[PDB]
Every structure is written in C-alpha cells, then in structure tokens.
Design a protein around this ligand. Structure first.
Ligand SMILES: O=C(O)CNC(=O)C(=O)O
Ligand SMILES: O=C(O)CNC(=O)C(=O)O
Ligand SMILES: O=C(O)CNC(=O)C(=O)O
Ligand SMILES: O=C(O)CNC(=O)C(=O)O
Ligand SMILES: [Mn+2]
Ligand SMILES: [Mn+2]
Ligand SMILES: [Mn+2]
Ligand SMILES: [Mn+2]
Lengths: 372, 381, 377, 378
DNA sequence: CGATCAGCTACG
DNA sequence: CGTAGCGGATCG
DNA sequence: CGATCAGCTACG
DNA sequence: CGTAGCGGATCG
C-alpha cells in the first residue's frame, strides 16, 4: 500500500528534521520519495518540526502519574459530575509548576515523564490550512449533503451534547454547522454487537465524504507524522492495525469497501471526526482506550479561540492552524464560542479495532523517546 | 497468417531441438514447413537451442517467491528510492547461492528461479547467430543513418536544450546518450501494431506513429528483421510458453476483430508483418541504461532484451541478484522487467538494444487472460 | 521458577557460544547464573555448540518449500500409502544437491533446508557430552530394571497375543527379540496431556508422572540437565518455538483454570526442564518409516538415541539419505514432513522423542509460531 | 483435501475392477487406502463394477447424433409442447435397433457417433449402502420441524386455502396416503444461486448453511454412497468427473468466486461428489420431462430407493421402459433424454446428481462433451 | 498534491 | 513542417 | 463409514 | 491389583 508508505516517509522525515534542529546540523532531504516530489508536504513537515522542537523544550510536570489518575477515573467519567470532578481536582492537583493564556508551544508530562498534552499553535502551514478550508467548505456548502439534511432535521424538531443545537454557531455561517465521522472500520449506533464495517459517510465511492478524504490526504499525512513524533509505538501500531484490516477480510463486513477506503486512508488513526461551527464544553472523551492520544486541528475565520484545561489550570490560544495532542480520556478540555466560523478535525482511536487486528494498544510514550 | 504460423513453427521446432539436446536423441528437422524455407532461421534456432539448454542446466535460486516480492513492491516502484530499495534488499536478499565477498561478473548462460521454480531472469550470451546479427546491424544502421528520419528529428527537437538517477523522461535524457563519434544517431524509437499514447489509455489503441507510413522508415525496419523477431519469439516460447501462446492469441484477435483498434486496416497490415508475440518493441540506439524497473507492463510479463553493435565491454547489472553479466553483441536476456532491477553502463563503442515487452490492457481488450509466469520444469514436459 | 530459568539461560549461553564460534571471538562465560552452577551443563553446551556450528556449515537444500510440501500432504499422511508417497517423491524430489555423489551413510553434522531457508532436518552425531550420556544411560536403566514398573506391567499385559497400522509404536514385531537388560517398551511423560480421543476435557498430568515418588517422577528428576541441553539445542534451531513453548508452560503453571489436578501439574512443571509439550521414551524398539502426524505442522521435534549398539541408522527417503545414528546422536526434524525410520540395531537402544501438542498452545492462549529461518540464529 | 482423494481412489479402484472383469484377471486390492480400510465401500465398488461391465456389453444405437438433436432443440424445451415433441419424434426416431417389454438387463444407448446418452444400471448399489441411504433419508424426512415437514404443511395450507411452472413441487405428484417419509424436494450444493438472486455470486445452499442442521448431517450420513455415485460417473465419463473435481478445487481455493466462502469451504470439505448439486425427491411421481437448467452436455445420475415393487423409468425417444426398482442407477443426458417415473406401489425416494455450467465458467474449467463408450476400454 | 507515463495527432 | 497540449487513474 | 489416535480413570 | 471402555473430530 503506497498510502502507508507515504505516511511512513512523512513521519521519518519529520523525525530527521527535528533531530537536525536539535543538533544544529540541518537535515537536507536528498532521497527520491514523495517528500521531494511535493513541496507542500515538505514545507508542512518543516513547520511541524519547528513547532514540535519548541514544544519539546518547554515541559511542565504535574505531581501525579497518568496511571493513578486513570485508576481513579470511572469508565465513563466525561466531566458532567461536579462532585467526582472536585474529587479529581483534590486528589490530582495542578502542582507547583502550574498554580495566564499560553501562546508558546509546550507539553504537560506526568510524574514519570509520560506526555499527557502537547500544545503546538500554528503547527499547520498556511498552504495546508487553505487546502483544508477549501475541502471543509465544499463539504459544508453542498445543498443536500449529510450536514444540510441533519441541519434541517434538527430544526424541525450532557447527553448527546455533540449534536446539541445550543453549541452550534448561530448567526452568519457560510459553512453548515454539524458533525460527521469517517472511518474505514466502524460500528454503527447500536450495531456494536456485529463485526466492524465502513462508515456510512464513506460508503458511496464518489460521495461527499470519500471526496472530502481525497481532498486532504497530505493534511492527514501531516497529522500522522506529528503523532509519530509524539508517540512512535502508537503510530506504528495504528499502521499495523490498518494493514491487518486490509489483509484479513474476515474482520470486517463489506471488506471490498473497507479495503478501498484504507487505500485512500492517509492516517494511522482509527477514525476522524469533523465538527463544523460548534462550541465544545469541557469534557473527557470516553469512547477510546485509556491510553489513546487524540489529535485536534482547528481552523476557520476566527480570532479568539481558546482551549481550556482546568486540571492543568491553563488556557491555550486556539486559533486557526493550532494542533493539540492530548489523552482525551484523561484531560478535561473544552472550546468556547469563537468570533466567527470554526471547524475542528479530531483524530482518534477505537481499541476494539486493535484487539480485532491482534495488535496490542501501547501505553503513552515518555518524552525522552523523542531524543533517542 | 504467415507471421504467426512462422513464429509458432519456430517455437515448436526450437522446443524439439532443446528436447533432443536433453535426451541425447538429436532432433533432425524433417517437416516441409517455414523452417525448412529459411536455413538462416534454422541455424539460428540451433544456436539458441544450444545456449538455452546450457542456461537451463545452470540455475540459481533466490530464497523467496516472485509473488511475495511483487506483493511488497508498489505499482510504480522503479528503483528511484534508495531507502525503499534497501528495505527490499534486506527483506528479499540474493540468498546463499548468489552472495559473495567480491562482485561476480558471469559469462556462462544461466537463469535465476524463485523458491517456487518460476523463472525471473535468463542469461543467454552469444544466442544470436552471426548471420542474424549482421542482418540486425544493417537494419539498425539503415534506421540510424537516415538523413531526415525520426532519430535526427528527435535530435533537433532537443537541440534547444542541448547547447544550453532516473526521473521524468530518463529514456531519452541527453546525459545517457553517446557523446563523441557515432555512425548511428543516438535515440529511441518504439513500434507496436496496437498502442496507447501516454495518458491516453482511455480511448481505443492504434498503430504506433513509427509504423503508420506504409513505406516509412519504421515499417521498412520492421520488414527488414522478421527472422530475428521470429527467433526472439521462439526463445520466449521456450522460457514461458503460455505467455507466448496468449500473446499470439491477442494478436490474432486484434487482427480479426476490427472493433478493438482505431485505424484497423493499418493495424492489420502491421500485424501481418509483425513476426513477434510481444505487444511492443523499442530500439534504443547509443544510450547507456541506468538501474531501473520497467513499471508500465503486467507484473507477470517476461521481457526480452537483445543487444548489438561494435563494443567489447558490455555489462548488465542486476543488484538484487548480486550479479553483473557480460552483455556483449549477440547476447539475449529474458527477465521480469517489473521485478528485476537492471541497467547497462556506457560501453567503449556504439551499441543498440531491442527491448520486447508487453501491454496488459491489450490482453484485456482481446479477451485473453494474462497468464502467471512459467515454472522452468514445464520446458522438460 | 528454576526450570524455566535454567532452560532460558542455557539457550542464551548456547547462542552466545555459537556466535563466538562464528565470528572468531570466543564467548567466555563470566555471568553468575545457572550455567556456572552446573559445569556439566556448560561442558555439554560447548560440545553442542561445536556440533551445531559444523552442521550449520554443511547445508543441503531441497528444490521445494516446506509450505508447498505440507499443502500437498493430507493431515494424517503417515506414509502407509505407497501410491501417495510415490506422488510426493515425484512432485518433491531430493534435488541435485542431495541425489548426486555422497556416501552410503552420512557421519558428518549437517542440515537440510528448503527453498526458503527453513530447516527441515538437523543431523548432529555425537552432540551429547559422555557425562550426560552416562547420566541418561543410568536413568533409563533405572526405569527399565524395575520389577513391576510400567515397562514390565505393559510387557505382561501383552500375554496371549504373543502365544504401520494402529498401535505400531508398540507392535511386537518391532521390539528386540532375545535377552535384554532393559525391558523393551514405550513410556510417555507430559505435565499436561490429553488421553487419546479425549481432547474435549481439560488436560491433566501424564499417568506416569502422577505418583509423587513413582518411577516416572524420579526419572524426570534424574535428567534435568539432559533436558536443559535438548531445550537449548531447540532454541538454536527455532527460537520462536522455544520461547512460545516456554510461555505455554508459564501459562499452564500460572493459570489454574486450564488444567485438571493443577497442583500436580504445577509440581511437574517445576521439575520440567524442557520447552516441549511431551517426551516419549522408546526402549529397544526399531522404528519403521513414518511421519508423526499428531503434532502441529511447523513443530520441530528432537530425537536423542542412546544405548550400546554399533550400527545405528536413521533413514530419510525423501532426502535420499541414511544417517549414522549411534549413541549420543541428536536429530531435529519436522516430524510432520520428514519420513524417518530406524532399523533394528545390534544391541540395546533407547530413544527420547521431544514433541508438541498444538492444543496446548491454544489452551494457553499462545499462538503457534512460524518456523525460523536458519540465518536468524 | 482428503474427501477428493477418497473419491479419486474410489474411481480408480472401480476402473481397475472393471478392467479385471474384462480381461479375466481379477483385480486384487493391495494398496493401504480408504478402500482397504472400508469393506462397505469396497463391496459397493465391486457391485458397481459387475453391473457396469454388464451394461457396456449391451449397447443400442440410435440413428442420429446427440449434437444434431441438441442443435434442433430449443433452450427450454422440457417436453411440455406436444407439437415440438412430435417434430422431435419424427426427426430423431428410435431406429431399427430400438423400434418395436420393460427392460431388465444393464445396457446403454449410444448415438450414431458412439456417445453415451443413457446408461441403465439395475441393482447397481450394494444392499448395505441402500440400507445406509434409506436410514439417512428417513432421518431427513422425520425431523420434527425440518424443511420437509414445513414444506408439506405449506402445501396442505395452500391446498386448503384454494378452497407446469413448478411441477417439481406440484401437489398432484406427491404420494397421497400413508407415508413414513414426508414427501417433498430438497437441494444441496456448496455453490448455488437462489431464486431472485441469480445475478449475484454463487453461495452455499440454504439447506446446508446450519453447520449442524438436518441438511449438513444428511450429507455426513452418506459420503460412501456419494463416493460410489462419483466413481460410477468416472467410469462412464472420466473427463467430466475430473473436470467436476477441478471446479470443486477452484471453488475451495479461490475465495472470490462465492459469497460466504467460509461455509462453502467447509461444505466442499464434506462434499464427496464431483457433481455441482444433489437433489433429494421424497415420495413424488415424476412426469416425462427434460431437465433444462443444466449444461446440454451434462450427464446426470439418478439413484432410486424405497420399498416398492413396480418402479419404471420411461424413455419415449428410445421406445423403452426400464425396470426402476430400489438400488437402480441411471446415468443420462437429462437435457436431451425425455424421462419420467410413474407412481409406485409404496414409498420411494430419488437422489439426482446434476451440474451447473456457470460454476465451470467461474472456475475457468471447460465443460466437456459427453464421452464415447470406447473410452471405457482404453 | 505534484508527478507518472517506453506517445501522439491537431493545427499554427 | 514542427510541436502544444494533452490525458486520467493512481502513486508515494 | 470403519479407522485414527505418541492415553487413561473408573472399577470388577 | 489389572484392564474395559471410552472419546470425538476428522480422515481417506
Ligand atoms: O471543538 C474542538 O476544538 C475540540 N473538540 C473536542 O475535543 C471534541 O469534539 O471531543
Ligand atoms: O539498454 C539495454 O540494453 C537494456 N535497456 C532496458 O532495459 C530499457 O531501456 O528499459
Ligand atoms: O526410534 C527412534 O530413534 C526414532 N523414533 C521415532 O521417530 C518415533 O518413535 O516416532
Ligand atoms: O424421480 C425420479 O426417480 C427421477 N427424477 C427426475 O428425473 C427429476 O426430478 O428430474
Ligand atoms: Mn474531546
Ligand atoms: Mn528496462
Ligand atoms: Mn517419529
Ligand atoms: Mn430429471
């Protein structure tokens, strides 16, 4: 599969670049691969390398380990319960380093050097941001696409807060607010009992979702390369899971479609969700494995984006081009209303795909693995 | 059709000659057929029989199957990526029969087979008889000494660049062509009865531009070498008989069925003077060849290279076999061009190469399945 | 657990000695581990390293892959069908390296590999140090001199009968006629095992091993260093199989919900110095040409022959070979692929066969691994 | 796959037995195979050899070729049209060897070019195997809520609700009265196209999909009988036998030719037959017909059993009636030869082994032309 | 997302 | 006469 | 459909 | 003690 080869090249090249920035000997790309043939990809990798090196040089530490924090969590603690969240705040305080709105790349590590949060502002190069803007605009401006049909279905008529109307941007939008999800292997609502299959959004071979994916393979390669810089075992394990889902047709239904989607799937993650013109309340993401690091990319036409992490006592500037990697099941996070239109791409995981593929899900990486 | 009958009979006769060499009961050509009508072809078939039997008795094996190698290759992996080639070389090494401390240049006819007895490479030095080599030399000289043929027109088309590693257009890069004193104009021409323009595999195929003038230089070169092409086709039938017969069937369907090609009477006229089971033939005059894989043909296609000219130091390099092969005039090499990395450095003189290769979409159009590579034992049946 | 620690360390040390022999920088054992605690084991490992390196330098190749050979075999093709064996011999011949110009019997260490570098057969003559051979001779003698041990009790049970095919392993045609110091017969040992036809219950301890101080448990206690040696050899030939067998034993020891009578099985494992599933002792029996069909396709079995005989031969027809099979000789082979037999010898002989049960791997949740390629050692 | 090896061994051994009967040098089975290990199979092969050798010595010839007959037939001419059948009877008469009661001796009908069109084999099946088949069919037709009883109540319900295009399940044909075995029709196949789903990829027959349903265990009860039938076919038409085996191997190997290929592979693993399909017709009379759903060149095999005394199979274009009592085997080009079986004085079942050419096309295996009888004697 | 492609005729 | 403008699924 | 199976507790 | 009767998916 050449797509997985491309994502490997992006990841490896990004690592060489970061190493060059650290040693003072600049990496010079000579190999004849996709990176030399596509300056947009090369430039985007260079920008991500700059931001990642800066973030790796600015590390805050909380006075507890992710393991104990996760053991105090209940299996579906998403942050709606104020009593238990106060319990968490007292048992796992921010610590002396964290007792201001940040703008500089940084990361939060636990007492045993595990990365819980990586803040990367302006990680995505303007070319790729333009590309993503165009793709999302095409998906959210179609007349009878999934988003418009859902948008009129909801006008005719927490708990399922991800599609609550109070959270969507009300006023002037050229992009249709809503939420869509894409994955080569997914279990539909209350179909979790069966084998996984392709997401409905991706099932038409020339539907709006498949073309949206075809519009952003280089953005997805960039996001995957960032993940590989932060957690290489997780990147490689996701790639192995994808390879196994491709090979072994007895793990999915409609495996023809799953294999095609994988062929145009330039990402090590299990799934990608697009949230258009919706505020995000403080929450924990409960649907993935404890150990999964998700990646958020925000874009649009706004100036006052903020991401709030209360258990770190921090607010982070969350403007177009900003990338955030985080343990979504551990870190409470939210994004208030912005002064304009916004979209978010959330790249995340399904542990059940991992056991099905026979690939262990790894524990979060320590930051020192960066420097080997 | 006399062309397809001629090459079919040449193939069958060559097989009988090789079998006689194997059993010790010499074949003696008795039938009153086209092979009796051309003593030159018969002599050349005997020489090919000698060299083919020798190569069939000297077989190296790599410790992997072509099928797994191809599954690891990407569809357009031509060898430009050195890191990817290092991955390939470590996952599919030459094996104990082929690794050595020092680079080995072979001189004896041989073949490389995979772990499942499929032929990947066949080395046949001095396969072509002096007579047929003389003929080919004369025909290629006629093509490359012309005053306003395709070769000089191409040399002028690049005249703006000239007076001013693979990559786009490497087959005609000026870096590779012979600088100095040449009797034959360096360049590349290609011939085919049915063919698709680059990027245009969406229409119906048509005749190659070189062959469209009914008395142009290309059709006249083609008419000059029907017995050399019969010999090349017969060799192919010895290495991969199903591919030979399937190519012949494809040609027959393209000839008969007129709704498969554009300009079909021209395609039929070319097929009538097409003494070859292959889809296409390319003539490369005075050009070195860098290490590459040919990525545009079917995975399972066996291509045939014939080299000639007046040079003494010819070498063909196969890195994934850890081998260099003496590649002097008259040498024939059959190889899975989409699997085998191969290149030819500059020689100390003038050289030309005839590359016979395939287009799977022609097989699809003709309704003929493309077969999987032959096992060597099928020769011995 | 000292059993698994001893065999793991023996395997690692043997690998280091073989590596030193290959590079020319001799391994020198400095660590304070199990190997220093047993100089006899260390000596035997050095001898095995020498013979293994010699065998690795003398490699014959068959012109086919084990995968294609096995795909043409039927799951219980033991060699009884002469037509089917002719089919196999014609479709999978010995090849040019094996058929043309060698002696009546081989005497030098060697191995047969397939077209994809997988090991099919490893001939290792004089592999066992004389000390360990003495030890095994004594333990097998102790098992075969008892009044009313299992060996004598089965010899009596064949009463009126005396006055391939089912039960060939104990056919009377094969056992030594005359006067024997050792009682001919067959015994089998395993920490977890299924009775024939009963792979539908939980596995339990081998019958021979259940008395806490019976003859079988003391034969096991007498040969821990011979078993550690055999296990280390196996790890040199197929490292994934060694480590996976060790994991299976570890799971059977830990997880008590896999076994019946799990305390007893735990004791057996504690004195089980071997990664193999099971061990069979064949005393004074010739062996007809056969394939062992009951184990996993990819399982490497190990045969050890001993006794006081001079004309021992192991016949592998599909390799066109006869191998000198005298006391101290070790043979590793894919029992499901390689036809092999041992004719009657001019004296008394015993064989220790170490082999596998794939259902054990399934029960322990450990996948059965693919055979290693020979270069990986 | 050991199943295909078993049927190959049965075919080869049967041929050796027939050769021994012809030369006068009896075959002696020495090989250590399934035939030596199973005396029931060996005895049954011996009986089939006796009857087949007798049938090959009694050959009638019609004065036309099967090819011209098929060329004059229309693609769905099943015999319902009396005008077309009168035309066929004038253009292809029985001929001087056949025009002129009920035959009882094993025989065969060949065409003007020695192709076998019909082989009559009375008491071909050994009593042991007939007992076995009786028991398996009785088990199939007595299951409490199995396919046959659910069909039969679907039939009573529709007859009651009322106050050929589906003649094979027409209610007039089934035995009315006292039956131990539930009348009906079932069909089994590893690769099959359901009604309404004939432009999809082939898949396993509905009857065989439950891994321990009544259909799969009926198949598990009669592998030795299925091996016997395949061996008979291999004696009459060896290329067809071997081509059916090749099609089965391709369907087993190539997982992209079928849906639910897991199930198809399991079924193939217990499919002891070179035929594409097997149908069981329990307690049903059979009107004169041609079978139109198979390849023109396909030779089907019928095995009849039960407890009846007056069984007859009618072939009008040969001007013949054939005694069709329990144990009788008939091989015939069902798409060419009109044939029918009247109601009998008791309970009866029929096992019909037949072909689907589309499976051969999918597997890339040509369907061969019917064998000539002389191929037996090579 | 820029590049790949064993080439060609329409047309200045 | 020469050469511009393809042409389009797919490749890393 | 009879045979295979590197064996064993339940019990006269 | 000694040994009868398993035991069941699968093999040709
Ligand atoms: O909307 C954003 O920027 C962040 N979104 C999330 O964390 C989410 O949807 O789970
Ligand atoms: O130049 C040679 O002899 C060989 N040439 C090639 O393989 C080629 O042009 O693709
Ligand atoms: O007797 C020997 O030395 C070898 N024995 C075997 O292979 C066996 O019992 O299966
Ligand atoms: O019922 C019988 O014996 C014969 N049956 C058939 O020919 C049939 O159903 O097509
Ligand atoms: Mn979230
Ligand atoms: Mn080439
Ligand atoms: Mn054995
Ligand atoms: Mn019928």
């Amino acid at each position: 599969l050449p797509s997985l080869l491309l994502i490997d090249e992006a990841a490896a090249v990004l690592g060489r670049m970061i190493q060059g920035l650290r040693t003072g000997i600049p990496y010079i790309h000579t190999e004849n691969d996709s990176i030399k043939a596509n300056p947009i990809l090369r430039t985007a990798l260079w920008q991500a390398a700059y931001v990642l090196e800066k973030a790796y040089r600015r590390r805050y530490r909380v006075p507890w380990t992710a393991r104990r924090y996760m053991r105090e969590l209940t299996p579906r603690q998403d942050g709606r319960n104020a009593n238990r969240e106060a319990v968490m705040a007292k048992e796992f305080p921010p610590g002396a380093e964290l007792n201001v709105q940040e703008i500089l790349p940084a990361m939060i590590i636990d007492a045993e050097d595990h990365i819980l949060f990586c803040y990367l502002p302006s990680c995505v190069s303007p070319a790729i941001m333009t590309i993503i803007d165009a793709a999302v605009g095409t998906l959210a401006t179609t007349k009878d696409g999934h988003l418009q049909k859902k948008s009129r279905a909801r006008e005719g008529e927490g708990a399922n807060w991800r599609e609550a109307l109070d959270l969507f941007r009300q006023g002037a939008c050229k992009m249709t607010p809503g939420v869509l999800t894409f994955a080569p292997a997914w279990w539909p609502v209350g179909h979790e009992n069966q084998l996984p299959g392709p997401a409905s959004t991706l099932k038409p071979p020339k539907g709006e979702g498949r073309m949206f994916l075809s519009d952003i393979p280089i953005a997805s390669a960039l996001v995957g390369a960032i993940l590989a810089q932060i957690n290489q075992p997780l990147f490689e394990s996701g790639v192995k899971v994808l390879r196994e889902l491709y090979s072994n047709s007895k793990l999915t239904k409609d495996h023809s479609t799953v294999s095609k989607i994988i062929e145009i799937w330039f990402s090590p993650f299990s799934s990608l969700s697009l949230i258009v013109n919706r505020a995000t309340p403080i929450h924990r993401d409960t649907s993935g494995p404890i150990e999964g690091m998700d990646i958020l990319v925000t874009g649009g036409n706004y100036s006052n984006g903020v991401l709030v992490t209360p258990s770190f006592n921090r607010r982070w500037t969350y403007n177009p081009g900003c990338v955030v990697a985080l343990l979504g099941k551990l870190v409470l996070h939210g994004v208030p209303e912005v002064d304009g239109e916004r979209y978010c791409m959330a790249h995340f995981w399904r542990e059940r795909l991992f056991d099905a593929a026979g690939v262990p899900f790894p524990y979060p990486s320590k930051w020192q693995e960066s420097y080997t």
